[PDB]
Motif scaffolding. Structure first.
Motif, short mmCIF file in Angstrom:
data_model
loop_
_atom_site.label_atom_id
_atom_site.label_comp_id
_atom_site.label_asym_id
_atom_site.label_seq_id
_atom_site.Cartn_x
_atom_site.Cartn_y
_atom_site.Cartn_z
N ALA A 66 -36.76 62.24 -62.26
CA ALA A 66 -37.11 63.66 -62.02
C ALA A 66 -37.15 64.64 -62.37
O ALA A 66 -35.84 64.76 -62.84
N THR A 67 -37.92 65.49 -63.08
CA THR A 67 -37.46 66.59 -64.04
C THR A 67 -39.06 67.56 -63.54
O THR A 67 -40.14 67.36 -64.01
N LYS A 68 -38.27 69.08 -63.27
CA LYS A 68 -38.75 70.21 -62.83
C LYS A 68 -40.13 70.74 -64.17
O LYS A 68 -40.02 70.44 -64.97
N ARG A 69 -41.58 70.94 -63.29
CA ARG A 69 -42.36 71.49 -64.79
C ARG A 69 -43.68 71.92 -64.42
O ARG A 69 -43.02 72.54 -62.73
N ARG A 70 -44.04 72.24 -63.98
CA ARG A 70 -45.17 73.30 -63.43
C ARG A 70 -46.60 73.10 -64.30
O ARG A 70 -47.31 72.25 -65.09
#
Lengths: 77, 54
Positions: free
Chosen positions: A23-27
């Motif tokens: 999991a890697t945060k993005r938008r």
RNA sequence: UAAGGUGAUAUGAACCGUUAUAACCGGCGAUUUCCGAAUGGGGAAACCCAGUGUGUUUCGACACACUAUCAUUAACUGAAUCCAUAGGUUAAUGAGGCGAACCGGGGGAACUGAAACAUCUAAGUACCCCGAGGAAAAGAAAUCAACCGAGAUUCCCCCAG
RNA sequence: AGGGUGACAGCCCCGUACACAAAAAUGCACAUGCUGUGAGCUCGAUGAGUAGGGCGGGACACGUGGUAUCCUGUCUGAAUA
RNA sequence: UUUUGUAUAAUGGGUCAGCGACUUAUAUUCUGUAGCAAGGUUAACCGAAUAGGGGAGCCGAAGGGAAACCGAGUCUUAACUGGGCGUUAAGUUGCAGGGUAUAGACCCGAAACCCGGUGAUCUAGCCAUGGGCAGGUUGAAGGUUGGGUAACACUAACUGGAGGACCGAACCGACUAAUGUUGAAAAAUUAGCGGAUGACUUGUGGCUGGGGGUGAAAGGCCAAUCAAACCGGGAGAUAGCU
RNA sequence: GUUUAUUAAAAACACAGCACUGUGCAAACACGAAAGUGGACGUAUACGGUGUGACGCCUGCCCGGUGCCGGAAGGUUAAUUGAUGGGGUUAGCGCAAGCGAAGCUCUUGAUCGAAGCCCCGGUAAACGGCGGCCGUAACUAUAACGGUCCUAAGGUAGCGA
RNA sequence: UGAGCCUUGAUGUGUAGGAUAGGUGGGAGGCUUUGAAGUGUGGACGCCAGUCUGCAUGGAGCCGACCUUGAAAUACCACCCUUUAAUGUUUGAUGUUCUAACGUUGACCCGUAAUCCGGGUUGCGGACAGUGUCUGGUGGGUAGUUUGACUGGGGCGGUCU
RNA sequence: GCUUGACUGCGAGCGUGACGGCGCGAGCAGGUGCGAAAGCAGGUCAUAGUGAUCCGGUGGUUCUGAAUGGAAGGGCCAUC
């Protein structure tokens, strides 16, 4: 702000799920474009920063119907 | 899309017929520069009376 | 309510008052300097500097009054561009900031646990930000049940680790 | 009940239970008046870029798994008791 | 105290007095005690409030099999001389205690990770505006005139004052050595030494912030510190270690 | 000159110069979610990244590997496109064993499909590399020279305890 | 113009044989004087066998079980298949045009005694660029981590069932 | 020479392990092979030739079928 003025689409965050599911945060950014609309009622070019999906909402409802709703909720055009 | 013409525009026009054209040719050229009207299911009954009475 | 009292460290001085105007307690008001949302412009907070209106047996200076921004409503005006709009001005009303927890929503970890560690867990927790109230949120079924039915939401105890 | 009074106070004092008291301001109740709001019957009407779907995610105990449902960044798109 | 083993020259304590370390909650198992008994017992809640009422539910007397299902038998197999597991023993709820589980879980203590704020009055760079650099030397280009040459070159005085130029105070920097090392000073004193018209130095004010800044580059500096500042919070992080 | 304030002041860093590469301006690049600013109010005699460090003589050989710049006939290949085939459901037909339409749904993934890779040609002041085994000049040793090792090529100049 | 799609017309040498017979269907007559057979050429297909057809000569016919063929008529009309051609619709690697999105850190004008921004006009680009979603290659720029143990200290060598 | 017992469901009792497990084993039931027959045969003279589990793939078995009837999935047994 990158907000769709008609449909209220605001960017949301998510995860880049890879093959190993790390999991890697993005938008999520909308497909926003500045389009110039002419109205038959007021005789004026109305510029609106709207989404690409929001342009199709204008096509069914009508530009007079859309700008009537922006007057109700206090949006400026 | 389903827009109805009014003018002597080139070979998709016959003074008003419902055609199947892209939305890019619909807006900003036919949706107002003149020459047409959007078909939002109100103009298909209004301009139909213009066909019959005239 | 009262014969005592003038807050305390903390005496003294000087009086006040004893049958209703001493003091004490309570309600309603007045004054309420300056700074602080600070709001006339600014500023190193508790300072500086104006605009307009009004008052003078001295019409110099001082005193008094008002002038922030935003949004809405209404009036008057007003370009490129003829009508129109953009814009400008004035008035009315409202908002600004603070405050411990609780609520709703938007963002959002890591230590740690897996005896290491990436899926996972920690955890939508800590924190940040917006908004509002005394509660908020949720709420009158496009819900469950199973051929019998039940009839919104929320909380508690079971079901149940 | 308690506290104070020169050592331990029912009868010393402040109080206590009980019986009372508000000019003025104010909270909450009903009663009633006024200004706006709207009843009832009958006849209709039934919420469209929406449901759903492609894709990328998130939330449901439920990690895409045989995975329904819910939310939507993107693309497409109905039916009409 | 830790050790195979310490008078040990292994560790801990100057002493005195106070303070200071196996708890609590909810579950589960066992022991003791007490009640009832094939039954025991309520939770929320009600309440004349621990009563009384409420049996929702949990546990136990029946198990076997993956399960449907079967049942004091069942399962396995086509069926077992059988076999696997059971029947023929009474448990349950309070209370206290011994354990486990989850929570900080006996106490003290990491180095560190992450988030939110605060700091460029020190230092590092830069911008804006000001100030300071005593004195003593070296004498470039150019200007001028003369010699010299066919004409340039070359050369001679005078004039000029160029320079990250030299020597050297104020100023700035800190190479050698001693003293100082519980100092006068959490880096200085004394005597020599380097730069000192510059890539200078300095006053005043501003900007650049933490995985970021700055850096003529040492992984240096960033409030007496920096292989990731300080403060607050997660946080009583964790610690198989003393 | 600069540097490890507070143990290292240097042979280090910097340096003008040189070369390659990036770059035609709304520059490349960089800070920035973005706007905007820096570069620059500059325009290839300019700017940025990198390498080396005045000057003097100079800087040889090698494109296989690893990078980059191209050229492309073919191979392979993502999103997407959904061609076929299979399965589930059941209207109907079969007195039964079973078969099975449409609809919906599950599953399978032919074709369409660019870079990249495979392939070919350049680039060393790009990262680099400039040999391993032998034979050969008076005794050893060394090798001007000559073979092999199919790894792309085997030290030129100068220097050397 | 390439490909799908819809009408309209060509189009079919096993063999005996009036003879380069498409299959199922209606079908004992339709066609010709709304001027026919059969000769004469142009263009053209092609297994040069022969057929199709414009123009024109022409001036009154051609058929059907006809007996044969495994299957009968170019007597005619229908839904079509094979092959092939031309219009018409849908969808596409390169080239051109258009402006109306969009771009304008071009000029000019206004809000406006404003290098921002916004609006307008015009020139030039232009359905590209650029951004969003999806996706392949690249990616220590950055982030989270792993990189074993017995061992006569460890490392090296060796071992693990 | 003739053949498939390198059988299937079982297994009293025993060895060896902390455990997971491993190894031996007569006999019975069913159906076979060889021998005329008594009998013997559940691999090889014995002791090494091995991978626990999770996760799935294949074949069989209505055991389950989140309203019902199926189905998907799972389990059981065989196996990769």
């Amino acid at each position: 702000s990158r907000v769709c003025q008609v449909t209220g689409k605001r960017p949301v965050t998510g995860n880049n799920r890879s093959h190993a599911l790390n999991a890697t945060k993005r938008r999520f950014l909308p497909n926003l474009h500045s389009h110039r609309f002419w109205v038959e009622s007021e005789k004026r070019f109305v510029t609106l920063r709207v989404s690409a999906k929001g342009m199709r909402v204008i096509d069914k409802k009508g530009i007079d119907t859309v700008l009537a709703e922006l007057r109700a909720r206090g949006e400026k055009y | 899309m389903q827009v109805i013409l009014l003018d002597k525009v080139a070979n998709l026009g016959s003074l008003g017929d419902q055609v199947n054209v892209k939305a890019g040719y619909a807006r900003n050229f036919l949706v107002p520069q003149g020459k047409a009207v959007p078909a939002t299911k109100k103009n298909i009954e209004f301009f139909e009376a213009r066909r019959a009475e005239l």
